[PDB]
Tab-separated table of C-alpha atoms and ligand atoms in Angstrom:
chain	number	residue	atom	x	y	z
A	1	UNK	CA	-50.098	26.361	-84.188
A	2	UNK	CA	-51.591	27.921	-81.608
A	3	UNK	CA	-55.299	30.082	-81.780
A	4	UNK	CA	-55.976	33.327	-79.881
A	5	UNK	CA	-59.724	34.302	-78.786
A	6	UNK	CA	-60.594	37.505	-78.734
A	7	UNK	CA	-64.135	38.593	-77.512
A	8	UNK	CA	-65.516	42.023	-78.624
A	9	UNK	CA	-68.452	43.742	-79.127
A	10	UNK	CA	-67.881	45.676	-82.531
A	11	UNK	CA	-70.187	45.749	-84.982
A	12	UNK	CA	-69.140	48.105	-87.517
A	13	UNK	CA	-68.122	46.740	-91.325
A	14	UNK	CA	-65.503	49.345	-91.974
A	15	UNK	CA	-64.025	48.676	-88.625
A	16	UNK	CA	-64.071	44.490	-88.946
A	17	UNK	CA	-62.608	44.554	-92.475
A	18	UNK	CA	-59.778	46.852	-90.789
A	19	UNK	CA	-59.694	44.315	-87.951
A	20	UNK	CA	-59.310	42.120	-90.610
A	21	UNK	CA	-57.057	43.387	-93.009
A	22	UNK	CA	-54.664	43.505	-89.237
A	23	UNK	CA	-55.195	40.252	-88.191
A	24	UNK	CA	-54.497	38.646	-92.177
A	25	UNK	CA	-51.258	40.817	-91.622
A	26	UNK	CA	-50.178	39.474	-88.338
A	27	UNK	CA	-50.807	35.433	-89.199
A	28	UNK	CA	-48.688	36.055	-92.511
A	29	UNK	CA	-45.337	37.764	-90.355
A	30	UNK	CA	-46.543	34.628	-87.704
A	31	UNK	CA	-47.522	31.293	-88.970
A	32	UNK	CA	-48.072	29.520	-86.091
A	33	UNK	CA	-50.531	32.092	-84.517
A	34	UNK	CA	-53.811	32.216	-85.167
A	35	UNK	CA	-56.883	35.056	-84.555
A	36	UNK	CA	-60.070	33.910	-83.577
A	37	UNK	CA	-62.442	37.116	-83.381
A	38	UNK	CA	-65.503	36.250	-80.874
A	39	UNK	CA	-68.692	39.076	-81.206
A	40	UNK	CA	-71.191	39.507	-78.419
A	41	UNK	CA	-73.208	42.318	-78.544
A	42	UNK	CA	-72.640	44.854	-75.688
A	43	UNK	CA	-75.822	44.087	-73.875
A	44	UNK	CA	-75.229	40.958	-73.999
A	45	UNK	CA	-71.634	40.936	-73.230
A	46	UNK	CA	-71.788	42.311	-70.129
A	47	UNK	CA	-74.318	39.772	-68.628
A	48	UNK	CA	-72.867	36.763	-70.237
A	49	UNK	CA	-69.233	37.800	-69.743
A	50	UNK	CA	-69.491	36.814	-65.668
A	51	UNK	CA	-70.312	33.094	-66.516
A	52	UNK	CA	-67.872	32.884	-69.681
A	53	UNK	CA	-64.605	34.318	-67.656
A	54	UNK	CA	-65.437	31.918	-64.996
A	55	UNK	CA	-65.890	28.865	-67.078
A	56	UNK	CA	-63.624	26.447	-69.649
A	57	UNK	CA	-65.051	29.001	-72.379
A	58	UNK	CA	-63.020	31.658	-71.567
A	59	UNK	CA	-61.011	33.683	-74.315
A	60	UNK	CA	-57.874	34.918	-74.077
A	61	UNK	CA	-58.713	38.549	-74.632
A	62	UNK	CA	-61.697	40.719	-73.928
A	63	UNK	CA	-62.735	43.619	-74.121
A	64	UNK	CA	-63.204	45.833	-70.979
A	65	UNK	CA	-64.171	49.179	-70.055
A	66	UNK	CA	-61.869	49.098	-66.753
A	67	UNK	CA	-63.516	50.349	-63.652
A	68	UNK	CA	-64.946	48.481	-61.140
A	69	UNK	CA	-65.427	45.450	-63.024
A	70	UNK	CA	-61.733	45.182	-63.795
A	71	UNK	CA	-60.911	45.992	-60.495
A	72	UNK	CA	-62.582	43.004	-58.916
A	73	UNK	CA	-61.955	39.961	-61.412
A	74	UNK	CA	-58.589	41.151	-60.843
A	75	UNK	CA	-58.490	40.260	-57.105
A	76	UNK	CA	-60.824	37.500	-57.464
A	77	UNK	CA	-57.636	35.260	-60.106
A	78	UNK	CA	-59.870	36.065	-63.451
A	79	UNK	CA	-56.957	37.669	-65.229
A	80	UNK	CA	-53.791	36.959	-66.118
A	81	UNK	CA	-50.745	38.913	-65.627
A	82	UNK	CA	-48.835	39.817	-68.544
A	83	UNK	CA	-46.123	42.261	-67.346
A	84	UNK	CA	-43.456	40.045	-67.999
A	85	UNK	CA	-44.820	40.731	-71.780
A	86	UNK	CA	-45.610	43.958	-71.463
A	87	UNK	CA	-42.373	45.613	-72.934
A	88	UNK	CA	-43.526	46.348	-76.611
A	89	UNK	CA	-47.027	47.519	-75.217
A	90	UNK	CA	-45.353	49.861	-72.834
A	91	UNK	CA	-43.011	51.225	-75.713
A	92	UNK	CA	-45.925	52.048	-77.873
A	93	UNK	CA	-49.095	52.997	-76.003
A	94	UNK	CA	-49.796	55.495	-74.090
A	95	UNK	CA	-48.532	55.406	-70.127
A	96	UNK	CA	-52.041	56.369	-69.121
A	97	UNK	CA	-53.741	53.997	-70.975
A	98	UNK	CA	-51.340	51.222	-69.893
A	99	UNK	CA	-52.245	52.711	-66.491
A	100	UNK	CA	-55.913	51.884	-66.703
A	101	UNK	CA	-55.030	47.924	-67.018
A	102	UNK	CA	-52.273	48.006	-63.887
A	103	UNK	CA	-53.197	46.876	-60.720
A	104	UNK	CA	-51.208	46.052	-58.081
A	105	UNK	CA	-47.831	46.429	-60.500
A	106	UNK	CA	-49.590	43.828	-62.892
A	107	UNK	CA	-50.571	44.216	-66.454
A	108	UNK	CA	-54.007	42.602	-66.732
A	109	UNK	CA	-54.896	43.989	-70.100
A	110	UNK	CA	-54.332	46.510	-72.486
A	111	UNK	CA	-55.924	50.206	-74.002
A	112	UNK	CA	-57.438	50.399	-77.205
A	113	UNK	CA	-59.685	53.422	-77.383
A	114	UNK	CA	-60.330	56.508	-74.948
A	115	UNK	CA	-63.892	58.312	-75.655
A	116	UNK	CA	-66.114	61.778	-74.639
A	117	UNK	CA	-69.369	61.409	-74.303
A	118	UNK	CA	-70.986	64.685	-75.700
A	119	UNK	CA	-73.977	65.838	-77.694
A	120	UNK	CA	-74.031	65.008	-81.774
A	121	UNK	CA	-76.927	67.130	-83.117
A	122	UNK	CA	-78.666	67.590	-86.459
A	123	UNK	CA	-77.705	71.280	-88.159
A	124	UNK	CA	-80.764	71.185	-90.416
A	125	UNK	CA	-83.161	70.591	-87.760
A	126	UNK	CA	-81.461	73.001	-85.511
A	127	UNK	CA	-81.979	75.860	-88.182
A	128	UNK	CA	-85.422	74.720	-88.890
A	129	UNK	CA	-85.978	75.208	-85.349
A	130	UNK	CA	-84.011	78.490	-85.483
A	131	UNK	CA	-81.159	77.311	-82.849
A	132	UNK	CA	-77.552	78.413	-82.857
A	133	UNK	CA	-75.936	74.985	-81.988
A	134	UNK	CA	-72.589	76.802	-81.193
A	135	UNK	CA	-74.053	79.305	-78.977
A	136	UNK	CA	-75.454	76.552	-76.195
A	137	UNK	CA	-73.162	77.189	-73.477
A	138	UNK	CA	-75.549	76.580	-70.594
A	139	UNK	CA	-78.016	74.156	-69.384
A	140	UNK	CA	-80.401	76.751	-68.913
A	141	UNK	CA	-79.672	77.665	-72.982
A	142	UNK	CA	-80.245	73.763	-73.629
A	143	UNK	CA	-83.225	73.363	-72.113
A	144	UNK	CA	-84.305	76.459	-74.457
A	145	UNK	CA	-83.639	74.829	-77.563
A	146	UNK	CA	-85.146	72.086	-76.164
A	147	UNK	CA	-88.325	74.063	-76.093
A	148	UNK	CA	-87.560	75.365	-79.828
A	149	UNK	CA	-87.535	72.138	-81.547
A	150	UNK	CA	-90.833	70.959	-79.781
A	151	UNK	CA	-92.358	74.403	-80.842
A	152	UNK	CA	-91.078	73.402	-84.463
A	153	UNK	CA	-92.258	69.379	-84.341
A	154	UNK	CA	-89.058	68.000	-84.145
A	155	UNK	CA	-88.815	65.279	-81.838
A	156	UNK	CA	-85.695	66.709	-79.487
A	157	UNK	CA	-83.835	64.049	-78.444
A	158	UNK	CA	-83.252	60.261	-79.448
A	159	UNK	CA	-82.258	58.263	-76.145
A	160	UNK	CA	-82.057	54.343	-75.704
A	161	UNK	CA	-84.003	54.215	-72.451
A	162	UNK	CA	-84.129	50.040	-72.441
A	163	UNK	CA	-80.298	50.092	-72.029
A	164	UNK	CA	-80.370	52.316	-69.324
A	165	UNK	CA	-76.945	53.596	-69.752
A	166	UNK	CA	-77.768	56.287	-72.756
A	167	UNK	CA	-80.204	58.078	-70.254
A	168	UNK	CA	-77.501	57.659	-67.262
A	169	UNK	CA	-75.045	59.606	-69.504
A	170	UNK	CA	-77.406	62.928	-68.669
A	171	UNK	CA	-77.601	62.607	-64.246
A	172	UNK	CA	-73.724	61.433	-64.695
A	173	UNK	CA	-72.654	64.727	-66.660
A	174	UNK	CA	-75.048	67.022	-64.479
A	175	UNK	CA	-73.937	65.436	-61.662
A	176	UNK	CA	-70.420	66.399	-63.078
A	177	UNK	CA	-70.945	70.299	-63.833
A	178	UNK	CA	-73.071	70.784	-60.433
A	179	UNK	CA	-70.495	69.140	-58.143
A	180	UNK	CA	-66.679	68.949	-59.420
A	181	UNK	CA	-64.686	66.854	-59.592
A	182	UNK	CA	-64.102	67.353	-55.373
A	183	UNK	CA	-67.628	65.816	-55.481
A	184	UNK	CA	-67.315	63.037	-57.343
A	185	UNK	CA	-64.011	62.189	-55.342
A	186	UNK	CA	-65.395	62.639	-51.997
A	187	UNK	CA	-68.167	60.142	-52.747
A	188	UNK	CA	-66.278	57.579	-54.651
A	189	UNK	CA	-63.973	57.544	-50.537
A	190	UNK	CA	-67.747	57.532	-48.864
A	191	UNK	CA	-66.755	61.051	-47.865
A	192	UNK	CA	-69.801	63.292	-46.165
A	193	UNK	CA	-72.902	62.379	-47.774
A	194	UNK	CA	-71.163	60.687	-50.090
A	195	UNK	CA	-73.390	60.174	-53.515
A	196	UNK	CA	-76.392	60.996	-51.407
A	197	UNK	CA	-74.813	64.694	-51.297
A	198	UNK	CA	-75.899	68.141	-52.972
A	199	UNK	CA	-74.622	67.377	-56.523
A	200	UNK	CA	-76.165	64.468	-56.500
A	201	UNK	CA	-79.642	65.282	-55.497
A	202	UNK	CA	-79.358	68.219	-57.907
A	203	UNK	CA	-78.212	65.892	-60.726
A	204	UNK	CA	-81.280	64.423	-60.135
A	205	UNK	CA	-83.416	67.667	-60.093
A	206	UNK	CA	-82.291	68.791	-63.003
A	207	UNK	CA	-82.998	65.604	-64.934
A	208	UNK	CA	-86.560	65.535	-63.916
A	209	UNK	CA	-86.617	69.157	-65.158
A	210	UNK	CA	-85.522	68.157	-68.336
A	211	UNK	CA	-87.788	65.217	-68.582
A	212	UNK	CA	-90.740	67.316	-67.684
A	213	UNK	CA	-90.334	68.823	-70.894
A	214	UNK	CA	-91.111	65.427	-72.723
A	215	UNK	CA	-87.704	65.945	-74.621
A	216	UNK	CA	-87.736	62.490	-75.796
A	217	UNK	CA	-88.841	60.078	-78.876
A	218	UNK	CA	-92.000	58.161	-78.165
A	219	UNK	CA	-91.681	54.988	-76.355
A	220	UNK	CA	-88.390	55.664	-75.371
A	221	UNK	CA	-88.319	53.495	-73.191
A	222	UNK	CA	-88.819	50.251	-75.270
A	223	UNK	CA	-85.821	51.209	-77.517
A	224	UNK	CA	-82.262	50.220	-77.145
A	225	UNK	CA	-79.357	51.897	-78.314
A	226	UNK	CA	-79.376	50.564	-81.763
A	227	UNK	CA	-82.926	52.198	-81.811
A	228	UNK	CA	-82.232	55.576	-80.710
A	229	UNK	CA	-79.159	55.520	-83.163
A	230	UNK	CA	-81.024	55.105	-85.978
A	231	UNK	CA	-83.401	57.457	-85.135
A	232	UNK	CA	-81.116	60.094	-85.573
A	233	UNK	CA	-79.371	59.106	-88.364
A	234	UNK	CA	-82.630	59.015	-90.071
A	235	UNK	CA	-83.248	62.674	-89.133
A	236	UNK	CA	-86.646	61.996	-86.647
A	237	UNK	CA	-84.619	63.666	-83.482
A	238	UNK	CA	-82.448	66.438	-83.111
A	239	UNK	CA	-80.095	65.467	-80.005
A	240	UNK	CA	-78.375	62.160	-78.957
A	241	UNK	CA	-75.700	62.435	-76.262
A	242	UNK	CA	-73.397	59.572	-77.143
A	243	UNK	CA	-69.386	58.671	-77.022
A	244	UNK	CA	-67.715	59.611	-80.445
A	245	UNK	CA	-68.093	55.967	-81.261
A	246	UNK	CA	-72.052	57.320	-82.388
A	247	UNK	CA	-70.112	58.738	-85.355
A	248	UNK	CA	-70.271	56.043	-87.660
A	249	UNK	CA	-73.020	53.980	-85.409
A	250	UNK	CA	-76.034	56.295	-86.904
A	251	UNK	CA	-74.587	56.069	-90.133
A	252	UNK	CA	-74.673	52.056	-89.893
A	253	UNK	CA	-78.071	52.566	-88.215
A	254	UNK	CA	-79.455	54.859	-90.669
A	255	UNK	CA	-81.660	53.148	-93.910
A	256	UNK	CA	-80.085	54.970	-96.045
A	257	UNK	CA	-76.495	53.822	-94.403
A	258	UNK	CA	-75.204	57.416	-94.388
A	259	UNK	CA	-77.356	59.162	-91.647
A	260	UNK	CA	-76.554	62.853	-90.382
A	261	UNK	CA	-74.221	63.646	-93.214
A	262	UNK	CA	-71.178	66.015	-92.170
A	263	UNK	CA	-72.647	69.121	-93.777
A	264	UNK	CA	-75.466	68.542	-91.685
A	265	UNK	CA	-73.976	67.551	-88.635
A	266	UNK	CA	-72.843	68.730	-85.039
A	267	UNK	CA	-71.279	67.860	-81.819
A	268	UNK	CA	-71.355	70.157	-78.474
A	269	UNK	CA	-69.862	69.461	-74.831
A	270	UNK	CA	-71.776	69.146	-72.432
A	271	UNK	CA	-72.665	72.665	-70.858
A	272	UNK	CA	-72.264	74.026	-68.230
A	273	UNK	CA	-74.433	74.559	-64.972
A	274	UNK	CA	-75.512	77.877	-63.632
A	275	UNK	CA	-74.052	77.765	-60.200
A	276	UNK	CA	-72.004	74.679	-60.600
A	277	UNK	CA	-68.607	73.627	-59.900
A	278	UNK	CA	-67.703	71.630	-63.217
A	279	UNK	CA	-65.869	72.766	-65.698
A	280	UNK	CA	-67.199	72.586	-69.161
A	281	UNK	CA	-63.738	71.065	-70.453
A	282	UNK	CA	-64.530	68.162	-67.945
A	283	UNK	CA	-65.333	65.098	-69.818
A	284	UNK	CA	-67.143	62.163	-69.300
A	285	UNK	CA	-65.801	59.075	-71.385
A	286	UNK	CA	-63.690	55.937	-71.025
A	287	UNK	CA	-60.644	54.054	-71.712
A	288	UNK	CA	-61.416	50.913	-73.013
A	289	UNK	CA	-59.553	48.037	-73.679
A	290	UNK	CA	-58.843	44.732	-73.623
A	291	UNK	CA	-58.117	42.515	-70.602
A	292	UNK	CA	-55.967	38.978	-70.405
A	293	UNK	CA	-58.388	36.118	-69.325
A	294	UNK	CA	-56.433	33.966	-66.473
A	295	UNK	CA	-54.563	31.288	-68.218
A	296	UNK	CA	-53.883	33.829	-71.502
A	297	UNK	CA	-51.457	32.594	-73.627
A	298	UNK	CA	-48.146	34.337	-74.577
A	299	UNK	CA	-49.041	34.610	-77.836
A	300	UNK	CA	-52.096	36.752	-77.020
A	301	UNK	CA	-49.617	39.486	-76.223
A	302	UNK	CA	-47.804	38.896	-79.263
A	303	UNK	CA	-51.362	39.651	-80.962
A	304	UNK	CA	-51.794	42.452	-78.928
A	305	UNK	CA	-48.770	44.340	-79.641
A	306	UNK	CA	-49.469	43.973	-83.135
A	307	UNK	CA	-53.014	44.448	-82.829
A	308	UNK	CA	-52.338	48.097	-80.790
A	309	UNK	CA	-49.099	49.730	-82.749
A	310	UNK	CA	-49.189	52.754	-84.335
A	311	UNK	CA	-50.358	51.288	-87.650
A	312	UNK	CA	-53.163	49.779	-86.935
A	313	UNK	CA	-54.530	52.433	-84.674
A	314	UNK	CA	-53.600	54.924	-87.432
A	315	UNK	CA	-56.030	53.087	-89.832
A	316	UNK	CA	-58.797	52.652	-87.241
A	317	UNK	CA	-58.420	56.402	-86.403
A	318	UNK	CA	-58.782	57.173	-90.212
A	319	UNK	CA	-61.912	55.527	-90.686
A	320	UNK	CA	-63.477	57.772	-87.913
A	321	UNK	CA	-63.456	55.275	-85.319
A	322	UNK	CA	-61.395	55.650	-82.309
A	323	UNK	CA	-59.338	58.011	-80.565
A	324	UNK	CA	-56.232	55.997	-80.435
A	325	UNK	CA	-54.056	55.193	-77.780
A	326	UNK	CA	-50.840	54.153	-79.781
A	327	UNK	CA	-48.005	56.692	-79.923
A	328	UNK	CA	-48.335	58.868	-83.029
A	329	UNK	CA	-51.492	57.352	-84.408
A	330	UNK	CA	-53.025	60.854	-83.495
A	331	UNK	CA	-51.532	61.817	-87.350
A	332	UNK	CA	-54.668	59.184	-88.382
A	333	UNK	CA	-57.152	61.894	-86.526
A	334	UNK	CA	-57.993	64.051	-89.916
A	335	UNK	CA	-62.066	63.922	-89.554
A	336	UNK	CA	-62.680	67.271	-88.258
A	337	UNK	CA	-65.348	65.873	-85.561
A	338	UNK	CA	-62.744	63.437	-84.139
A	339	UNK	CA	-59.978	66.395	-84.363
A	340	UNK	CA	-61.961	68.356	-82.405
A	341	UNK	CA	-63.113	65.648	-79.607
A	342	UNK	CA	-59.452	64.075	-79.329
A	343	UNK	CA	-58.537	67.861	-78.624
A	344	UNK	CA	-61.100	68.001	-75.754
A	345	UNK	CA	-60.086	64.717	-74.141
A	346	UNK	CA	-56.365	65.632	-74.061
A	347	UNK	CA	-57.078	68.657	-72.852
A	348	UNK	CA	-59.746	68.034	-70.125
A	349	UNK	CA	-58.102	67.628	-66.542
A	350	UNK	CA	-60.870	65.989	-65.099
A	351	UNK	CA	-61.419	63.026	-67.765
A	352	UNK	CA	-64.083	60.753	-65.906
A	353	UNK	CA	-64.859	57.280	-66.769
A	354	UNK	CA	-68.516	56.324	-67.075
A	355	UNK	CA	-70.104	56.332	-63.553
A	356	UNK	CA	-71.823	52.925	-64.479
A	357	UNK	CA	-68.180	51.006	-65.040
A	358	UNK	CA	-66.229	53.127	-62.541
A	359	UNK	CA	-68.952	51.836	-59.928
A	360	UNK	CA	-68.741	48.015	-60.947
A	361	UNK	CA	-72.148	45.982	-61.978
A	362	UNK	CA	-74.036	46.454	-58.378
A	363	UNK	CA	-73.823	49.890	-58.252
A	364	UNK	CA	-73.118	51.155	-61.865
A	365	UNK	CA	-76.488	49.372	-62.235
A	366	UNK	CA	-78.426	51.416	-59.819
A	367	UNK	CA	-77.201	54.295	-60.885
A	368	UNK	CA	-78.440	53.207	-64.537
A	369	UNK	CA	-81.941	52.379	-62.692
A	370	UNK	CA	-82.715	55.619	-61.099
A	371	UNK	CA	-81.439	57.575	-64.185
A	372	UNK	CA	-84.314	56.423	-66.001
A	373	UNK	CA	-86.263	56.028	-62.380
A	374	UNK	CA	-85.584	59.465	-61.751
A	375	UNK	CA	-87.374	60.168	-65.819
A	376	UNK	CA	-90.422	57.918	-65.106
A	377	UNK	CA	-90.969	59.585	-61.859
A	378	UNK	CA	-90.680	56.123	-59.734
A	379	UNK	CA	-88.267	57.997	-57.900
A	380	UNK	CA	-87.240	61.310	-56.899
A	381	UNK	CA	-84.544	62.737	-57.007
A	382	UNK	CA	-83.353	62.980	-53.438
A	383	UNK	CA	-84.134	58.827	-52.752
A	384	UNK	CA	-82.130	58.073	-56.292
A	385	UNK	CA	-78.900	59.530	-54.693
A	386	UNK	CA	-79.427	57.979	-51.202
A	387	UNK	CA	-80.026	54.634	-53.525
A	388	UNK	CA	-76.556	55.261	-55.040
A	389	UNK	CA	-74.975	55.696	-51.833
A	390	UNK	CA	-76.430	52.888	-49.974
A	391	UNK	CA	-75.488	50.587	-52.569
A	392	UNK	CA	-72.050	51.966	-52.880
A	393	UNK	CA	-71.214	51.954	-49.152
A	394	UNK	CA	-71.714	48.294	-49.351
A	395	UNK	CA	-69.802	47.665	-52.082
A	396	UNK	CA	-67.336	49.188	-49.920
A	397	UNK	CA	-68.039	47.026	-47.559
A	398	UNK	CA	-67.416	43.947	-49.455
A	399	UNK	CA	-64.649	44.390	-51.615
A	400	UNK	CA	-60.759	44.965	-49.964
B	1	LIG	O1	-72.112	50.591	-69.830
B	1	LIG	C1	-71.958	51.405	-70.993
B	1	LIG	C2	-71.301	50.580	-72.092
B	1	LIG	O2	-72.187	49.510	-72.435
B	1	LIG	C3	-71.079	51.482	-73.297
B	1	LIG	O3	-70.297	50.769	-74.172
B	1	LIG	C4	-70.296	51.310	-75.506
B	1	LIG	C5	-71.617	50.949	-76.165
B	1	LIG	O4	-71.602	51.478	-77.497
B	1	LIG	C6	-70.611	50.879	-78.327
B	1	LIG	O5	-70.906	49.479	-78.413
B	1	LIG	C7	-69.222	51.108	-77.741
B	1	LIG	O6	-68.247	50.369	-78.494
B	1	LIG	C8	-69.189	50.626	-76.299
B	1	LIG	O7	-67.899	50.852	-75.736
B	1	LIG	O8	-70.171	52.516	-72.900
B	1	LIG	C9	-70.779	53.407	-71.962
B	1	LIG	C10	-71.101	52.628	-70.692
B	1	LIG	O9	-71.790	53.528	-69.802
């Protein structure tokens, strides 16, 4: 017998009994494997994941957001190429999510999820407010309803500001709609002015004008995402921008383990900027997966394969959970929410992964610092894009 580690960073109990139910299935059609499921919470994942890949503690499987991250503990020998297993996965995934976990013409992980990022919002407190939630197109008509729920005493939006990330979601998405994708993909080949260029610095204007509203939960700062979750789902702010994986989070988050029911609940993409050259069917979002550990075992891929086909992607997609990657599992997409958001990413033809992962640790985690920088006023927001760019330049210069 032979044992497979899997780290992950789910916390859900509708989605571990499902991962469950899977891996009981699996071990019964193959005796001699065995599943070992490893949690670390996200926060802690990331920092603790450099030492654990690096050491004699290192699983078989983890999960990974691609990027930057990927990109590098692939050329540095931290993964393990599985191509030479790779033929089920490549029959039943999809060839863009395979794509994500190639490099070089090696398979160094799998796709289990793609995401959007966009805005969930609370229907009752909109129409206490007296907000339209369809009719925000424009940043201009979000900063308005911004204004609205203050006016009515409704705290407007619920961020995690201790994580970072949850506030970075906002200058990565204006950053988006003022510049293009052109933008974006001029900077990320240190093109012009790179991150330090027009999009960038207005990115940066346009979150400070937001902030100077006071849009945000007391203490924001002090809460992580688990925090601002629950917030909403226990109706004390109107906004959160959050992947589609918020669905069930605020429920789980909520005390009364239901949060923002359906009846009372919305979601929005992001809008659009007056002026801009994004799209509002661009989408910010992932495709996450998991990657092979060097020294992964063959019967990780075996897991895998099972772990990934349509059926169990089909259940997780029922519960609400993901956006699946598996062939056909789309029939599992019945929630009207995820419907509706699956619809957007397929259809979105700029689909941009988070601009902390696709920048790797260094400079991902500036650009989480002066997204909150920018907020606190410790920076402005001409020096937070020169920050970016500086930092990315020598990223460039130290990586092949
Ligand atoms: O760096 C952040 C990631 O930490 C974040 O990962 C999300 C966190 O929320 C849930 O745990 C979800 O399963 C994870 O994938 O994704 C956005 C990225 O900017």
């Amino acid at each position: 017998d032979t044992t497979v580690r899997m780290m992950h960073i789910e916390t859900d109990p509708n989605v571990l009994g499902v991962w469950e139910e899977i891996a009981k299935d699996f071990e019964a059609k193959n005796p001699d494997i065995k599943v070992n499921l490893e949690f670390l919470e996200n926060e802690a994942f990331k920092a603790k994941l450099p030492t654990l890949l690096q050491s004699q503690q290192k699983p078989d499987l983890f999960y990974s957001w691609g990027g930057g991250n990927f990109q590098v503990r692939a050329e540095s020998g931290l993964l393990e190429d599985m191509e030479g297993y790779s033929a089920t996965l490549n029959q039943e995934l999809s060839a863009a999510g395979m794509n994500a976990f190639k490099i070089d013409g090696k398979q160094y992980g799998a796709p289990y999820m793609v995401s959007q990022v966009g805005f969930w919002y609370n229907k009752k407190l909109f129409k206490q407010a007296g907000i339209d939630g369809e009719s925000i197109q424009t940043w201009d008509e979000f900063l308005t309803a911004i204004e609205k729920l203050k006016a009515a005493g409704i705290t407007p939006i619920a961020v995690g500001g201790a994580d970072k990330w949850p506030m970075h979601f906002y200058w990565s998405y204006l950053a988006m709609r003022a510049g293009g994708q052109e933008a974006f993909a001029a900077a990320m080949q240190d093109q012009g002015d790179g991150f330090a260029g027009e999009a960038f610095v207005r990115a940066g204007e346009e979150l400070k004008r937001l902030a100077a509203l006071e849009p945000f939960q007391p203490g924001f700062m002090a809460a992580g995402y688990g925090e601002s979750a629950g917030l909403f789902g226990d109706y004390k702010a109107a906004i959160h921008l959050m992947g589609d994986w918020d669905y069930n989070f605020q429920a789980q988050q909520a005390v009364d383990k239901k949060g923002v029911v359906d009846s009372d609940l919305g979601f929005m993409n992001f809008p659009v900027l007056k002026g801009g050259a994004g799209a509002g069917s661009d989408t910010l979002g992932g495709i996450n997966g998991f990657a092979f550990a060097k020294g992964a075992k063959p019967e990780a891929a075996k897991w895998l394969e099972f772990f990934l086909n349509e059926n169990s992607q089909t259940k997780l997609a029922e519960i609400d959970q993901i956006i699946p990657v598996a062939k056909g599992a789309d029939k599992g997409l019945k929630n009207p929410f995820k419907q509706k958001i699956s619809q957007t990413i397929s259809s979105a033809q700029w689909h941009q992964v988070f601009f902390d992962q696709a920048l790797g640790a260094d400079v991902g985690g500036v650009v989480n610092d002066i997204s909150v920088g920018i907020v606190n006023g410790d920076v402005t927001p001409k020096e937070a894009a020169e920050q970016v760019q500086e930092a990315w330049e020598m990223r460039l210069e130290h990586h092949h």
